Amino acid sequence: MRSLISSLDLTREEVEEILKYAKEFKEGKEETIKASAVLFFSEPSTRTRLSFEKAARELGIETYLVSGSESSTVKGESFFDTLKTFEGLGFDYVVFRVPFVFFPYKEIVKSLNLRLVNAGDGTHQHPSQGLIDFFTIKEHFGEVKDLRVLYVGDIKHSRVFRSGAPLLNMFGAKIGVCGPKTLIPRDVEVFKVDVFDDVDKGIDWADVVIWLRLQKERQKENYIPSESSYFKQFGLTKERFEKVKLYMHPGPVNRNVDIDHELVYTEKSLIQEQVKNGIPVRKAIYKFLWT
Amino acid sequence: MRSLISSLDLTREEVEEILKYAKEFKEGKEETIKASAVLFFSEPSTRTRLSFEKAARELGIETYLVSGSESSTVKGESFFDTLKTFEGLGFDYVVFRVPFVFFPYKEIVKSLNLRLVNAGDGTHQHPSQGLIDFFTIKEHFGEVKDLRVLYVGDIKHSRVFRSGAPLLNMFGAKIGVCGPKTLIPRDVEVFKVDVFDDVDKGIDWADVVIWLRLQKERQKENYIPSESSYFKQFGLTKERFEKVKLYMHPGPVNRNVDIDHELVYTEKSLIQEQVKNGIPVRKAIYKFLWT
Amino acid sequence: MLKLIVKNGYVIDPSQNLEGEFDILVENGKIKKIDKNILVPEAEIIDAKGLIVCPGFIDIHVHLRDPGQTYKEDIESGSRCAVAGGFTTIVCMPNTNPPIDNTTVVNYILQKSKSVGLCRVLPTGTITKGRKGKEIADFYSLKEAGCVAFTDDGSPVMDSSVMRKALELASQLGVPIMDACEDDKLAYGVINEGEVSALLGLSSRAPEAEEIQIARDGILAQRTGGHVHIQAVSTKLSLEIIEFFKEKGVKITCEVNPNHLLFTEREVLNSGANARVNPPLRKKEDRLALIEGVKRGIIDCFATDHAPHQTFEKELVEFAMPGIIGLQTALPSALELYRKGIISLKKLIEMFTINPARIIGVDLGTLKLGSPADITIFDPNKEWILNEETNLSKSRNTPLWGKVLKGKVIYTIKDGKMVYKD
Amino acid sequence: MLKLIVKNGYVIDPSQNLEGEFDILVENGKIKKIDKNILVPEAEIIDAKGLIVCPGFIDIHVHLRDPGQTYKEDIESGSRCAVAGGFTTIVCMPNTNPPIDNTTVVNYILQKSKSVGLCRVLPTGTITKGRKGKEIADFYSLKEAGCVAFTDDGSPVMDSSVMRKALELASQLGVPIMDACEDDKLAYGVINEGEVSALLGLSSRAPEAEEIQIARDGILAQRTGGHVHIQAVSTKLSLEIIEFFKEKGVKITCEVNPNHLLFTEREVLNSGANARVNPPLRKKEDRLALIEGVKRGIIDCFATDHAPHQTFEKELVEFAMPGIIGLQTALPSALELYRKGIISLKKLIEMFTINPARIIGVDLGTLKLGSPADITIFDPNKEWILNEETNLSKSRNTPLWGKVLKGKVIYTIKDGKMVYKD
């Protein structure tokens, strides 16, 4: 009966198990889980919320949606008390996305009779996205071992990076980061990463590049002089398209900031593939947590 | 084919009937009602909305959710016209929570081919919560007759008090109130209540104490000098915990305002029990209103 | 100090309907026995022969200026004034700087007063935070720390719900509101709206400013059940309004500043800014009505509103700080009414002792067996002059400066200890 | 209490280069003689056989939370912690509520501390009014009332002229500035900018925030002639900068929180919000540099920055109040360095006694003849656990909660009076 709060808590075996279910679901496996899930979102979401929702429903899980600013959070109900409320209401799963870092989480998880699934907690973790990104990379290449995976952009504020990098590392991939030096953590090498000052070197090095969106709503000061200059320095431009081998973006894309307006859906883009992998990976997670 | 707008409209027999269904549902009774319900919330809610929703779904009722500020209320549709819209759309039930007092209501109820269920109307009524509180008290003690039930806090702004007190009274319980004198109605004795100036006397008197949240979003001026002083004067502090026999809170709790941070889930607290009783009581209400 | 005897004095204890020539035995700071010619082995003796012996006086309206304005007065200088005037208990007002709207300021005052060790100083809290008139203060914490009442003195409360809420929360706690009654739209000038303002063109303060708030407070007291104490009453209509609410059983009490018994607005022409005070000195008809309100029991007690200000704050009337010192002059001032046969000596003592005690709900102002040995001993006939030789205040601001007073404290006793002697 | 003798202990008084097995005679709260086998008629005796006897410890960085946050700790609970930890003198920080920026708050603390009567509590004042960082506070009135230093702890001063003006006006008065060094543009997150912030995405506080202000303060101290004391030093570069100014003869002193000697940022992963502190726990290299700065005499004293917060203020790191309690754990924590042979026992005592005394200019931290009999007696080897049985703080916020400590106070003596015993 467990929870998935952080990629850092998954063993190799657990990832193999999840991704095996995900592949099975992608190939059309049906399965019924008689459960209910409440999806508690106090940050915006399109794909993460809808894929968790649709994944649940296709498994027979009844889904309930609560957005933070309509919930009794507005009356001062703490995060813990909200989850405890979900527990009293008989929910089996709680899929949550919140604007703060949920750390420490272990004692709270342990104290609840609930299957908690982190759909994003501030700048901290988004484990299902890391799983989707790993699965997407693996589906493309066969294995991730020794692959060179470059993340570009706002690393500092990225729960997508923090969920994906450890999983890739754990299976022998090599991670690189490139972005405005103001948005690269000083001790980013805690993820065993190479740092590229220059995105063109990073792109030549990379087997796959994951562009990340500027987390403007999370940034406590201005970190970059401008979006169009950022695009020239770091973005997937038309010139860079010739050289890029393959690329990803967890979404949503900011066109002409991250990726050129014309380059979102090319034969080199796995972006739509990440979307399509959302439901099977998120089904795999409900299943993996069903005891 | 009726509605439940106010506790004041329930006879003894009706309450016995509702609570009998609630007990049956709590003990696992299944039942199907082929109906649809629209849940129309223009104030925040977690537990009331989710328990009405989950209650409906477990009875086979299709549920639809509308939050006020996404609805055509924003285009000037009046409350009545919204309900009439629900009627044209074929809803059987309308569960509503609104920021104003729905009074008078009888003529409007009578004019609609709908089962209206008040999930909270301003400072006026919240009948399902009064039923849940009565049921919770009754499940604990066996009967409510001659029990001493103390409500603490913002009485003036409390639809929870106004729904619970008449039901308890009707079955012979004794109601007491204690709170900032600025938040006790001058003619609170219209509920046949004793008034305690001092929460420690109230706590010694009470068999069960229901802490109420300060209705800050309803208060038209400042009534108390501060939240931490309120907590010292009226809150369930650690010192008071030794003396309190049993306690409740309709939720959400404001920790260290109503109830000490450590005292929300103790062996003396029925708070979680109120949450767990939500669905069976709200099922009982749908059933009670199904003709 | 195990044992003290106050011998041969004329004892008056109105709380007990007790008077005559009796001795008082004090044991461990407390009243032990009251009887004819008491004698005990190894006792301290003070001889009160030819003098009046009564409970220590209680002044429920004093400005100690401490913290924040200690060049005017401080807890020490005010306490010396108090005891030199016969007061063993004073209530200090909360218009200090910082104001008494938190428990730190209360505790500072309590601790400093204990260190000084002359009279009991009982703090009040503000009605509003910062005394700004907008938000009720934390009554619960302030009462628990030792405040005995709430007032925004010397500022009125202008919002009626604020005042209502003050009364509600205070009565819930069992303590009164003391209200400084002067509507600030009608009282923003410097002296009474009467003959002197008309003659000189000084800005004025309308008597209705006081009356309207007293009427408001009586109504609020009536409807909330709270107790409101009206500070420094100054007009005939005011007393009429108070009596109208007292007649209905409303918990409304009041006090008079003895200066308002002695002086009218005309004093502004003789004493300049030392007659500037809020509420102002008003007309003859008001002065006489006040005396009549004392006689008829409408005014519940004397209270000085001892309000010291320095000489440079008492120059041009327009710029002068309002207030008059009075702790050392209260008794001879009151005794003027006794001499004219307006009140009895018992009545004068009631107004200084048991009446103020009952207003603030303290068990003092009494010589009941077992109660604290707070005793004042005075000569109703002894003449003296308030001047540099005799003034214990840091300030001098009173029209009685340099004038002959009749009536004077010989001994002040607090918990069985002599804290003052002539 | 005329006469007390501390017998058979191993006395260490670094201020006098005095050590050996000596007895101490105390007369009227003061040190009278120190000699082999002293014996006097009708003396109190405490036997210190097998124990270390030294001057009472002085902690120049303590949060008493009093006034205004007394649910965290108050003067009483903090004083019990102090004495249980071997401290006879503590300096309290001014980030109370209301803050210590006026003489009422100073006096409240002084008087309350006298009532409590366990250790000497020396207040500091704020650098700025309200600690808002804009206007210098009234140093003159605050020093006169008893403040021994000014700090805006736990807020940095961001304007350089404000800091310069603080240093100028303080040095004119002969008192130091204690500066909470963390530039608020570079330190507005919750933990160190290192591995843990990178791994978890918690907002961070850059080591340069501390370094830049320490460098600024050394320069200001140099040019004004004022004395600046750097609180809770936490990085290698910081110590390098301090030493650079000490080398030039600048009056700059510093302290280390023993927690920074014991823990790194990694502790955030093991203890969660009980490792949230400003300045943060930083890296291994910093921890080791700190220990090296203690060894080489760059760090002048230990000071706890005892900073209690309740458990509900120590839940999710992002929302947690920063701070660690430390008064009861300072000594065993320090003794860890003694056990590893990093510092001598004399050196450890210097850092708790004479060094902090000299920083704040008080004649304490000594067993000199005629000086106050503030004496601490301790067992360097006695094991205990900080838990519910043993904690005297109202709060529990320390990563050492529940862990085995070695080194413990057996007796604390203040003015010849035993105020604590094991």
Ligand SMILES: O=C(O)C[C@H](NC(=O)CP(=O)(O)O)C(=O)O
């Ligand atoms: O928002 C991003 O930049 C990446 C990532 N995005 C998503 O999960 C997609 P969505 O917000 O549409 O669910 C996230 O961290 O929320």
Ligand SMILES: O=C(O)C[C@H](NC(=O)CP(=O)(O)O)C(=O)O
């Ligand atoms: O809000 C309260 O204080 C009591 C009561 N609360 C509830 O019904 C719980 P919720 O708002 O989470 O549905 C209400 O009146 O809405």
Ligand SMILES: O=C1C[C@@H](C(=O)O)NC(=O)N1
């Ligand atoms: O209301 C007040 C306050 C007082 C003072 O100086 O405090 N002086 C006055 O004359 N009237």
Ligand SMILES: O=C1C[C@@H](C(=O)O)NC(=O)N1
């Ligand atoms: O600068 C500070 C202040 C302190 C507090 O809680 O007062 N706690 C800290 O951790 N750092």
Ligand SMILES: [Ba+2]
């Ligand atoms: Ba695992």
Ligand SMILES: [Ba+2]
């Ligand atoms: Ba009916």
Ligand SMILES: [Ba+2]
């Ligand atoms: Ba919305």
Ligand SMILES: [Zn+2]
């Ligand atoms: Zn006054």
Ligand SMILES: [Zn+2]
């Ligand atoms: Zn500090």
